[PDB]
Design a binder for this molecule. Structure first.
Ligand SMILES: N[C@@H](Cc1c[nH]c2ccccc12)C(=O)O
Ligand SMILES: N[C@@H](Cc1c[nH]c2ccccc12)C(=O)O
Ligand SMILES: N[C@@H](Cc1c[nH]c2ccccc12)C(=O)O
Ligand SMILES: N[C@@H](Cc1c[nH]c2ccccc12)C(=O)O
Ligand SMILES: N[C@@H](Cc1c[nH]c2ccccc12)C(=O)O
Ligand SMILES: N[C@@H](Cc1c[nH]c2ccccc12)C(=O)O
Ligand SMILES: N[C@@H](Cc1c[nH]c2ccccc12)C(=O)O
Ligand SMILES: N[C@@H](Cc1c[nH]c2ccccc12)C(=O)O
Ligand SMILES: N[C@@H](Cc1c[nH]c2ccccc12)C(=O)O
Ligand SMILES: N[C@@H](Cc1c[nH]c2ccccc12)C(=O)O
Ligand SMILES: N[C@@H](Cc1c[nH]c2ccccc12)C(=O)O
Lengths: 68, 68, 68, 68, 68, 68, 69, 68, 70, 68, 68
């Protein structure tokens, strides 16, 4: 399973959270206005956090996030 | 199987429950207004609880969380 | 294979019965009004009982549970 | 797979029958009005029986069991 | 795969036939009016026979067994 | 995969043919009017023949046979 | 392993099975009389099926008919 | 996967092609008007060719072949 | 579930070419199809790419396609 | 999965990129007006580049490339 | 799983982020206007980033990227 993320505005952050007993930030990808990121769930990433104004697509539909 | 969760307002709390014989929360991710989280059921998480005002998506359809 | 449970009122319990020759209650997750709980069937949970008023989602459609 | 059972009246019984060369009632889960039970077919259970007024959801469709 | 059976009238027989070289009924399960039986194909049951007035659901459609 | 067979009148025979090098009948299941049979293909049965007036359902739809 | 449904609309329908392997040849012909229905699988021994006679045929790939001769 | 081939006329040829480094026909099944042939791809058959006026069916839909 | 291709030759002179799987890529066989003949073939341990020349009707799980000659 | 590429003009090139740590072209297949190439992702090809004017069909829909 | 990317502007940038504990780009493939790149997630690429104006296709539908 993967998630699609389009940055509608500057400052969007695609954060990865560690898989396992411990849960913490292990990476944050900065997406500029109009950039798109397609990312999977991996051995290392069992959860993903999105901040900023962005369009999101998953196998389970579409979603929106806003800044501030 | 993954769950998508949108924080409609501040105070949304995404909680993970341990897999196996015992059942406790091992993690709580708090989302601010607009932040989106996408998490899987995993080796360590077999049940998930959503607290606060949130939009929720699973393979089984959409659902809304209510705070208080 | 998961079940989604939104509690329509306070005092809602999501009970888990054990897998194996024996069938007994091993845990009860209390849900306050508006709280949503997504949970799986597991090596330890092979059946689930929902007591109280709530909205239920499975791959096999939707169901509602009434309080006493 | 799994079967969803919603007791529409008090005294709805959900019996588990043993898998294997022997066929026996190995457990009886009593359901009262409103309560909902989602249960699987397992190593130990290959056939399920339902007595009482209840709503039933499987993959093959919906079904109803009468009381008396 | 599983078969959903609901007895329309009393004394319905759900007959399991043996998997393997030979073919005899290893079991007969009586369902009373309004009761519902859900049973799988198993290591021991490769054929099932319904005798009496009952409603039948499988993945391949719906069918009715008749009294006399 | 399995076959569903309803006897439209007395004298319906569900015949199983041996899987493997040989091809002979190893069992005939006599179905009376109104009865329903649900059989799989198996390590012992790789071909099934129906004789008499019956309604049949498979994952490929429905089909009827006529007697005499 | 997909199967084939066959109903004989008339008398003298043959359901032939051809051997699986490097050699291809008939190993069995099942006679179906009018109205009879046969449902057969593809097996270790049978990789090809031949239908002779007027019959109705059902596979995962749709419906088909056959005529005598 | 399997092919379904119906001869619309006499002179229909169902040709089997060899799996492996080499590619040549190892069998030619001759079909007369009205006859139907269903055949799989196999350890020995990784391609099939149809000659003659025939009606063909595959998972990718239908197709007619013309003789000459 | 090992995918396959369906190819019907609209006119004569149709070639169904098979390219090799592995480090290298070359034609290891060309099947000539003539007007009206149909060919269904799989990708395999030896065939991972297929090139079609001439005028034909093509069918795959991803839809339909036509090819022209010249 | 696999890709269908239909050359709409002369000078169509279908390029395969290497799978593994290193990413580089390992082949380029020319296509002339009218020709159709059908190709798989493989052990050696994990990325595919299409240059020129062509029609493209994937499991994720159609797409048209242009030349110049 | 694979991603389809058509460039609507010269110098489009398709970036592959490394699979594993560390997340950095191991490759940047350029696409000029009209060119199409079809690529997979691999043992080495667990996340993809698109920079520049382009059409993007995935199993989860369509998405556009904008440059600047
Ligand atoms: N190196 C990361 C790449 C990754 C995938 N999904 C992500 C989500 C957020 C941040 C990084 C990622 C991994 O393989 O796990
Ligand atoms: N470390 C947790 C991360 C996690 C995934 N899904 C979750 C849901 C809620 C809380 C934490 C999580 C895990 O891999 O299991
Ligand atoms: N620790 C429990 C968590 C659980 C999953 N599903 C449930 C249903 C009810 C109660 C608890 C649960 C388990 O892994 O099985
Ligand atoms: N311990 C039983 C619980 C069970 C599952 N499904 C059931 C249906 C009816 C009664 C009991 C059950 C089991 O794992 O098999
Ligand atoms: N012990 C039997 C119980 C059973 C399952 N499905 C059935 C259908 C009919 C009769 C009995 C059964 C079995 O596991 O096979
Ligand atoms: N003993 C038989 C039972 C059976 C299954 N399907 C059938 C069809 C016809 C006759 C018998 C059967 C078997 O396991 O193979
Ligand atoms: N003994 C045969 C039964 C069979 C299956 N499919 C058939 C088609 C035609 C004739 C016989 C059959 C076999 O296993 O192969
Ligand atoms: N022995 C051949 C029979 C066969 C199957 N499919 C075919 C298609 C064409 C010709 C022959 C065949 C094989 O298994 O491969
Ligand atoms: N012997 C070839 C047969 C083949 C299958 N598909 C093809 C496409 C083109 C040419 C030959 C073929 C192979 O197994 O690979
Ligand atoms: N030898 C190459 C053939 C190939 C398959 N798909 C392709 C796409 C483009 C170029 C070449 C190819 C391979 O096995 O991988
Ligand atoms: N060698 C790379 C090729 C690749 C696949 N998908 C990509 C996406 C972007 C950049 C490169 C790639 C790999 O297999 O992973």
């Amino acid at each position: 399973d993967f998630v699609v993320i389009k940055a509608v505005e500057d400052g969007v952050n695609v954060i990865g959270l560690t898989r396992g007993t411990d849960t913490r930030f292990h990476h944050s990808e900065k997406l500029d206005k109009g950039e798109v990121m397609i990312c999977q769930f991996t051995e290392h990433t069992s959860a993903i956090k999105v901040r900023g104004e962005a369009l999101i697509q998953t196998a389970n539909g579409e979603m929106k996030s806003e800044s501030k």
